[PDB]
Amino acid sequence: PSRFTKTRKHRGHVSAGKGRIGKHRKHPGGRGMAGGQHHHRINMDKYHPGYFGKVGMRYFHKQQAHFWKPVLNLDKLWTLIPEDKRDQYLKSASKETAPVIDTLAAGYGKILGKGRIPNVPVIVKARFVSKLAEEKIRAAGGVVELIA
Amino acid sequence: ASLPHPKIVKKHTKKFKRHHSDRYHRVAENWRKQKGIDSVVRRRFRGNISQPKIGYGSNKKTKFLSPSGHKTFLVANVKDLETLTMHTKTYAAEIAHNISAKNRVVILARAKALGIKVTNPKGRLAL
Amino acid sequence: GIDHTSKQHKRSGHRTAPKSDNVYLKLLVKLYTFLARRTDAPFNKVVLKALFLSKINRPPVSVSRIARALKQEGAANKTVVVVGTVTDDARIFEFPKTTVAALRFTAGARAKIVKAGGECITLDQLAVRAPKGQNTLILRGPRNSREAVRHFGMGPHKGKAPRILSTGRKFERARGRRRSKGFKV
Amino acid sequence: SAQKAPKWYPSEDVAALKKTRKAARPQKLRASLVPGTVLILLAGRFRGKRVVYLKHLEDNTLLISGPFKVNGVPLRRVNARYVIATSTKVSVEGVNVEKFNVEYFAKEKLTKKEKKEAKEIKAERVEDQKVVDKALIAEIKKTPLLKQYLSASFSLKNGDKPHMLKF
RNA sequence: AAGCGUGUUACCUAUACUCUACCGUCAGGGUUGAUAUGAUGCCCUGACGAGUAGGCAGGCGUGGAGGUCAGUGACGAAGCCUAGACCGUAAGGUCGGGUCGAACGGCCUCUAGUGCAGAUCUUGGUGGUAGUAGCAAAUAUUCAAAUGAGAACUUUGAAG
RNA sequence: ACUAAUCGAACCAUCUAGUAGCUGGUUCCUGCCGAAGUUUCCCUCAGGAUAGCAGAAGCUCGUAUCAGUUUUAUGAGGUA
RNA sequence: GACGUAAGUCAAGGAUGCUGGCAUAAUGGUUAUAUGCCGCCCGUCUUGAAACACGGACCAAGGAGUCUAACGUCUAUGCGAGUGUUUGGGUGUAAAACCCAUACGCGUAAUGAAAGUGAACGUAGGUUGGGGCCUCGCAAGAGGUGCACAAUCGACCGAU
RNA sequence: AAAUAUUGGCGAGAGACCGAUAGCGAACAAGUACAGUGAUGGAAAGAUGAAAAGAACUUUGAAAAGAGAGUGAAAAAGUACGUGAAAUUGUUGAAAGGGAAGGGCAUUUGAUCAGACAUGGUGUUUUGUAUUUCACUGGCCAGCAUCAGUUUUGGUGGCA
Prior knowledge:
This is part of a larger assembly, with chains A, B, C and D.
Chain B: E1 71-75, H1 78-81, E2 91-95, H2 101-114
Parallel strand pairs in B: 1-2
Chain C: H1 23-38, H2 42-52, H3 63-69, E1 79-86, E2 99-105, H4 107-115, E3 119-121, H5 123-129, E4 136-139
Parallel strand pairs in C: 1-2, 1-4, 2-3
Chain D: E1 38-41, E2 50-56, E3 61-64, E4 76-79, E5 83-84, H1 102-105, H2 123-140, H3 146-151
Antiparallel strand pairs in D: 1-2, 1-5, 2-3, 3-4
Chain B binds four RNA strands through strand 1 and helix 2.
Family (chain C): Belongs to the eukaryotic ribosomal protein eL18 family.
Subcellular location (chain C): Cytoplasm
InterPro entries (chain C): Ribosomal_eL18 (IPR000039), Ribosomal_eL18/eL18-A/B/_CS (IPR021132), Ribosomal_uL15/eL18 (IPR021131), Ribosomal_uL15/eL18_sf (IPR036227)
């Protein structure tokens, strides 16, 4: 609201918090990113380094559906199983009946390896897996089989 | 009557009249701080008007106390007044301006019967 | 006039009360003000101070951080106190039996603690049993892990993230960041 | 309501005062004031009258009477600050003064009804003055010009300065 | 010397120094086993207090909104005037008196087209100048009567 | 020169509330703190950015890893 | 604390005792005036304004840091590895309120120009400091633990 | 076709909007009066009272109008009409005035204004038992005494 603005506190004081000498004007320094290479160079090198230039190639008509690849680490791998049955599979780690974690149905494209899943085998259907994640699933006894 | 109080010392009794309120009719007597870059009143030159300072603040024990020694309490009806039944030694009721003359005689009826001082018992009389 | 070596009327710069109007927070401050004043324990002063802290300065302490704390030898049965919230953590799977005293408990953390046999007490239920903080253990969440902090103190070669909203290529990867274009920060 | 309420009403109780440590010590009179000296009254109806200082009353006042036959000043109490002591002294060892006390001079008990809205002398107040000044005047007559001295008032004739003047 | 040089004291007075009271800010503290209107309160101790640009904080005020005081009011709301009073350091509030005629307050919040001495500010109005400058080119008017309340100015007549 | 009292580019309406690093103004009170006119860069010198000075928010702690200071010891200078 | 054998008293953590007058314009207040001393005309630009710098004849009303999109720090709140109902649907006493699915945004992973790859040797490390806690300890203090945080060497992931 | 747009037209409902210098330029015979050759530009101006009940009649005046009476609750509502501010003006009253005036501190003098305490009151035999018929105080201003704090000015004493 406006009744708390300093503008209401600045009533009476001649310059409205903007200075006698400076004389708050329209646009003393330019407009927008103006003079970024000329008189705002220090600002655009201290706080925005890398602002000016042409790095990289150009991907014409990039579609982010191609680059959709949300990554699920191993610590979160056990979040996909519903909480109701999570305990029932943590206990009595069964090689002959292993839980299947369909990360794709849960909205993840790749499995990463942030590490330390419990020693219980899981069948992990996923599009992609990192080397370390694959070796950690095997170490726990599960398997990762690829899908699309 | 009223509880003992230290002798009232206002520490400044002249009202702070805005600088040049006399000179210009457009400048009202209400106090405004002179925020000029050159005003002698702001700079506290000798021989110029005193400005309100927190030094002039009255004693805490005697703030909002009338010269009689009561905190005035603006009262509208009998119900508002009967909240001073157990505070008569400090609060002196004051009948609001908009209370009709017929309703005043009943307000002072209770105030007299309760021993509560009224700051304006003579307003809107019938005579 | 005197030689003012330092600033006059300099406020202590520390919160003396919650900035909030949360009355239940003000009751805990009221109780722990009494305890801080009337007890010898330096624990209640820390809790009283910590209750004043703001939301960024009261970061979530996950049950994992408590579980990490309970691994300290001699601190197995110590009661854990978090002046803040406790958010559950999926990274761990087993939670050691304990009691945790905290302001707020996310529903996930409450489930995770009580299934471990824990007792999610509040800071009043703390002060009832342990006014001086007997075998207590105060934990704090990672304060400088806030995302707003990585942009603090940015400058040339300060190794800090720029305030950029649209991260990617062609956004702050140019002259002033690689040798091939201009210089390096 | 015209005004809402004060939530922290002042306590009605009137506070009992502290035990002040101010005892009432006896007054130490000036060395110049001795029973029998002559005082020049400075204030009152009898300002400038020469009187005789008789006794030091317990109310810090001085019981004095320039004998009523001499200057017409009755037995009265005065204030030791509103008199000037003087070198000259009379001997009043033989005059009864011990019967004069504060309860003797008490004017009257005043009430709200007995008020002089618009507007004598006691026989004891005359007899006692007589039985006092009998000794005083009998003593006075053995020295020259003292009775005339007491009768004649005091005034600061121009040119003199009391700072360089001694009595 | 009431000049110059010098010295001895005495004396004068700053918003300075000391002490006291009060205000405020800051700081450090005390204050909850049937005792306190239940603590951003109360109290104790101490130090501080200049200020533009500027920053923050606590408040005052205006138009409207929610709630509430079963609020005020034609027995007089609002408004306005008041060398009449009271409170507040102040913004301001309150009351009395006159005018007036129909609505308007207090408090807890919300909200904004929210506070004026300025801008050669805008609009409106009114002043001093001031009963002043001015009503001085075109040669020029005058007498009487008539009408009329009233005739330098109208009518007619006669002159010019 | 003149082109409707307008002329080295008429008048009217609109884009238009054109832009102005320039001028003027910028509306209540009190309390607390309280500067700068310097660095570097800029078609920069009536202006900006930047560091500096300032306020606020605080935060981690509680007499210290301190100081517009001296002393002792030890350097350094090349002015008078 | 003093005097006191002690009882007590006391100039010892701040004025009590007695006396008088008046009880109202007496004291006090406001206001006008006189006097003594002081006081330059405000706003603004400015190193510097009473300026022979500019604006201001006066008065009433109007009159100037607003709203939005996107953000930054900070504060509060709700939830919290999640979070966000209000695009929309159902509903409704009907622009309110209530309820809700899927998505989608941001976050949970980074790095590289890109192809791509994608975070535990270790009790998620060692060291130094570290509030707090625990033990011993009349008590200082000594040990163990040591969150956040600060520094530093690591370790891991991306790029070269 | 529908989902979509819609500051125009017609109708309708609403409002945390403006409230007659605002809101449309236009609350009223407003795109009107008026200005411009023209394209165009373009105002101001709301409210008597419930009802004209809009002042019959008398008198002065040429008349306007005045004074009466009269309506009306009010004419301090008379169509120059709700309220009626300030600038400015008149009159009356008060005060002051030797090239300004105005202001500050203090007081004089004048004018004018609030407060007590004059308390159920330390009580006192109800004319067929709640008026305590002599009340305690402090209200305003002073004096003395004994003290305390800060200080000032002396006079003497002992000693080094």
